[PDB]
Ligand binder design. Structure first.
Ligand SMILES: O=C(O)CCCC(=O)O
Ligand SMILES: O=C(O)CCCC(=O)O
Ligand code: SF4
Ligand code: SF4
Ligand SMILES: [Ca+2]
Ligand SMILES: [Ca+2]
Lengths: 611, 611
């Protein structure tokens, strides 16, 4: 076997037992890795279990691409049954943990059970131990990693959670190298429910590559393509921050709980501003186009800014000062909590206050008030903090504010307001893990322009794009697993991947073979949601926030415009027609059979009638 | 006598003698104050003196508006025969030292001679002493003021010099309240040559006011007008920083030693960027539209930004990040040196390195190298820091680089590139104190738009608008002396100034009275220049830098466009005709008499032939 190790390190914090699981090569080829392997493991190992119970599984899934020097391939997936959604949840992050874990002889690491007290996992090649972390508990992500490296050395990849993860804040994430995060659906709160404070990994093994010479050839070639791309220079200057002005220009910038798509103070939180405030630039391993743009916040503190962070914690909260937003950014990072859901849950809170629905809390534009709630959310201090820490879906059920509850399947919506963007809306509506732009960033194609540089329509070809995009973004790249920005941003050729995959694993994959795996992973994940939801499922699960229907843009040429329920629904059907799912959103026996997923049928058959 | 005290404080550092000179009421009425009063003094007392010798007079001249609550009337002028230009030089700065000086019973303070050791002047009403400052010498202006306040309390006005003054950097200035500055022509280098480290003032006296009730009402009315003007909200947001975009939009932004009028990275150093980097806002005494905007620099240090600082230290140096320009900004402030002349002297070096004339030194964009040269200049470290500390005119004489020496009369050009702006060019060419935009910021009128929100022409009416602007900017406002911005930026009616003066001094000044007074100040100063230049003088002293005539814009639709000498010469002649000067730029006998300057004629007649 080449590329894959075919080994999965298993760590039980309840029994303290550490073993290595050897899975079949066919399963490697079948799911390639990352989200694929993760999906495979959760179907089998996380059946009907509570997301915060010790029976849940936390998976750090890598891919054949990881551990080896491949263009921006130092990513990693973190999965487990989500405490936020209740279905499948996963995330990605660039970190040396990815390089060191695969070089330590593992394709993934699964963690079950829960420690009786705070602990951290230590992994150095074949030496794996569960050590006491009693002294780290309570510390920020930054400090935790720093102290651990002060002990073991700089040559280790470190994964940690902050108080937010510790206090089981619903959308807690996992952090690495101060800035890289993973797991919006609550991978951090799962890690936290297990009293697992961190993970330190060190690898030195030589990974078996089928064709060594071709890997160096392809990689070296892919880098140069990236370096000479016309988009390199600008990317290097603004990274994802360049979407701020772009989204404002297109009325897609979420402002005050997605109320409007235009923020009057975009310019003071935009990319050029970020540029004149940049003091450092970091990146994930093996990437020659770093986009970890670090600035100094309002308190002179370093803060790594990303578009999604600035949009949900900036324009979305009515705060138009980068130095200030950056302060909220840094807090989410050290507390270990998703910028998007945090910024969305606080925005939700801000509107309920202006509506007089909530007696107290910060309102739009209140920076100091927002900073306070964020910290209270992290430490779950106060009734409000404890509520906003549960996400907008849950918080809304309690308050009775589903009107402006911006989520899908439980997960809070990203930074693209789709009042007049059907394909993007459908992308949020169908995301495999809940509202997120990860899998289908169709908005750029839907408009015709891109940040690196209009008529509404529900043409059923839009659904086709989403599906095609999902296959690559929420599929191929979430399985290799590698960064998709070299392609999405500077236009690196997608041909390098099938060729690199063959140079590594020695297996030849046709783009059609890959689409199948991606479509396979999507039907298995959907299957998971259904099984876990106990057959309680219908096409509405795939619906965008009601607000994109009953309300409209509040300014500009498209003032008053929005999405239409009928045409959206008709577009959902096209999506289901292309995926092979029934009108309920569930795969059909022919599709499950067709995708090598027969074992799923009897199981879904036990919860509902299949088609 | 009302308004004026008719009293001037005299301190002789050499002999230590301290007295109070009484000056006539026609002298006050005649010259009103500030710059008016300073010119009368310099003409009489700084005859033939070495700008850096003990005989030179350091004047701190206030006016009828100072010491009283007048709209943004907390200004003060600093004058002396200039060390950089060799002619009449002066500056203006907002400082509590303006209020306290007048509340102590003085209209102005005149330091002469030279202390035998570091000393500072202490003033508290009638108690005036020359104290030892031996423990202060060497410390930054910021630190000097903080330390003195820790001793005498916060309720005082402090004026200081930094090591640039101490070391006699030719464009050394006087600083106050970290940020406020005065004296581009080297007032700080004169303060330093006297071994004078600071001046602490405190006043408690009540100033005689002709009409107490009117002054109140007029002031209350002026502030509200400011508060309600449409441009107020935006002025509060960007201050003078709004001039970067607007200047870039008009090809007026000095870029790489005035090489171009456009900067490709202007955005990351603009008012919107600044806006999102703002942590504090300060202002001068008695102003309800504060504009001292404080940002955090690349090093986390507070920096007070003003358009001119960012233009000559940013885009002019080819440095496109605002946090890095702010760093250079802070250095200027704490070292006590004019941001403008420092930036121009540096850009000149940068262009000199690039062209290979200089074998060592920084280049455009080299922030680290510019910061080092800036510190090397303040401390006069090395042949380079030493040459640069002399200004571009002197530096150019040494390097033989007259071609890209951006100065007029020895004083370096401001933040407005005039390849295609004949009025502004005439403004710099005729500025009383040498190149500056203080007296005539005509560029806005010439374009038809202003920052608070094209065909080249040499219409002789342009020479009229300059003279008109000078009467107000380089006259009325430097004599009162009050801030011009409330009128210039938000548009406060200029009609409050003649009424307020009247309500304070009791005298009725009509606009023609003011135009005559300002004109007197202009002919007197020119007189000073000619006399001190020993009759060696001609129209070329009023010419803009050669670069704008033999080179043109390098980009945009005006690419290649430049200024026509012949047509400019004609514009200058219209200027001399209007002012009543000969084709040599020297006042005409009939003109002097006309302005009550007969006493100038016998004196000038000793060096040249009058007309
Ligand atoms: O700006 C974003 O959040 C998305 C960047 C492009 C991508 O998702 O691939
Ligand atoms: O932007 C500047 O430097 C000038 C502001 C307007 C004025 O000079 O009055
Ligand atoms: S482009 Fe950005 S997210 Fe992608 S690998 Fe490079 S630094 Fe990481
Ligand atoms: S407008 Fe600015 S410079 Fe003028 S008095 Fe006010 S704070 Fe000072
Ligand atoms: Ca980040
Ligand atoms: Ca200043």
């Amino acid at each position: 076997m080449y590329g894959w190790w075919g080994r999965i390190l298993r760590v039980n914090l309840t029994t303290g037992e550490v073993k290595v699981q050897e899975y079949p090569e066919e399963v490697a080829k079948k799911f390639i890795g990352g989200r694929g392997l993760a999906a495979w493991i959760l179907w089998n190992e996380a059946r009907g279990v509570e997301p915060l119970s010790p029976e849940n599984k936390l998976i750090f899934a890598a891919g054949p691409f990881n551990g080896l020097p491949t263009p921006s391939g130092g990513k990693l997936v973190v999965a487990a049954k989500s405490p936020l959604t209740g279905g499948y949840g996963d995330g990605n992050l660039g970190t040396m943990a990815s390089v060191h874990l695969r070089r330590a002889g593992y394709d993934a690491l699964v963690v079950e059970g829960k420690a009786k007290k705070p602990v951290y996992i230590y992994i150095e090649d074949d030496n794996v131990s569960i050590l006491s972390a009693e002294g780290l508990w309570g510390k920020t992500t930054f400090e935790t990693e720093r102290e651990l490296k002060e002990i073991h050395g700089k040559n280790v990849g470190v994964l940690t959670i902050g108080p937010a993860g510790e206090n089981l804040v619903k959308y807690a994430v996992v952090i690495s190298q101060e800035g890289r995060a993973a797991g919006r659906p609550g991978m951090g709160a799962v890690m936290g429910s297990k009293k697992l404070k961190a993970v330190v990994i060190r690898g030195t093994k030589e990974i078996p590559v089928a064709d060594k010479e071709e890997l160096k050839k392809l990689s070296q070639e892919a880098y140069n393509e990236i370096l000479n791309s016309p988009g390199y220079p600008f990317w290097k200057r603004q990274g994802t921050m360049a979407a701020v002005e772009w989204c404002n220009t297109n009325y897609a910038l979420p402002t005050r709980n997605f109320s409007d798509g235009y923020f009057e103070f975009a310019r003071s939180i935009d990319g050029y501003t970020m540029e004149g405030m940049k003091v450092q630039q970091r990146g994930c391993p093996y990437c020659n186009m770093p986009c970890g743009n670090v600035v100094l916040d309002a308190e002179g503190q370093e803060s790594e800014l990303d578009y999604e962070n600035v949009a949900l914690l900036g324009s979305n909260l009515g705060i138009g000062k980068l130095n200030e937003v950056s302060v909220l950014n840094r807090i989410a990072d050290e507390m270990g909590m998703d910028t998007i859901s945090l910024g969305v849950s606080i925005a939700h809170v801000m509107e309920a206050v202006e509506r007089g629905i909530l007696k107290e809390g910060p309102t739009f534009g209140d920076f100091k008030g927002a900073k306070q709630l964020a910290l209270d959310i992290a430490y779950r201090k106060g009734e409000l903090g404890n509520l906003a820490a549960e996400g907008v879906k849950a918080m809304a059920e309690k308050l009775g504010t589903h009107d402006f509850a911006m989520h899908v399947k439980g997960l809070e919506v990203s930074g693209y307001n789709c009042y007049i963007y059907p394909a993007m809306a459908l992308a949020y509506g169908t995301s495999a893990i809940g509202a997120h732009h990860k899998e289908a960033w169709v908005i750029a194609w839907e408009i015709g322009t891109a940040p690196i540089e209009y008529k509404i329509s529900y043409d059923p070809i839009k659904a086709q794009k989403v599906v095609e995009l999902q296959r690559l973004r929420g599929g191929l790249f979430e399985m290799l697993t590698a960064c998709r920005l070299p392609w999405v941003e500077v236009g690196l050729s997608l041909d390098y991947y099938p060729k690199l995959l063959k140079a590594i694993t020695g297996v030849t994959y046709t783009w059609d073979d890959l689409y199948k795996a991606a479509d396979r992973v999507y039907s298995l994940i959907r299957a998971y949601w259904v099984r876990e939801f106990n057959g309680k499922w219908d096409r509405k699960m795939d619906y965008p926030p009601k607000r994109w229907f009953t309300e409209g843009l509040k300014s500009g040429p498209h003032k008053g415009e929005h999405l239409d329920e009928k045409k959206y629904d008709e577009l959902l059907s096209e999506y289901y027609r292309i995926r092979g799912w029934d009108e309920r959103g569930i795969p059909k026996k022919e599709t499950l059979k067709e995708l090598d997923l027969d074992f799923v049928i009897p199981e879904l058959e036990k919860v509902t009638n299949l088609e």
